[PDB]
């Protein structure tokens, strides 16, 4: 017992540039996509939690973060700090 395939087709799926929360690809003024830098998942600009605005997303030297990693990054909780280089 083993079933395997070979060979996969081409779609729109395929591209993959629709966002993980509806995974779709429909866009239009303020509903733009966004792509994070740490998941690297799209987020479409509605779909995430922030309404993103077009000029963020344009933003070429701006850090998006999706909340899902926001959150995460998120370990000190605002509390009592051990150890830690303090940089600008
Ligand atoms: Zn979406
Ligand atoms: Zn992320």
């Not at 087709?9 to 395929?14: K, P």
Request: charged residues 20%; contains cysteine.
């Amino acid at each position: 017992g083993s079933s395997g395939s070979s060979g996969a087709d081409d779609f729109a799926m395929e591209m993959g540039l629709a966002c993980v929360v509806c995974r779709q690809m429909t866009v239009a003024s303020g509903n733009q996509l966004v792509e994070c830098q740490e998941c690297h998942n799209l987020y479409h600009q509605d779909c995430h939690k922030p309404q993103v605005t077009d000029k963020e997303v344009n933003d070429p030297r701006l850090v998006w973060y999706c909340a899902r990693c926001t959150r995460q990054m998120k370990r000190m909780a605002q509390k009592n700090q051990k150890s830690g280089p303090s940089s600008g």
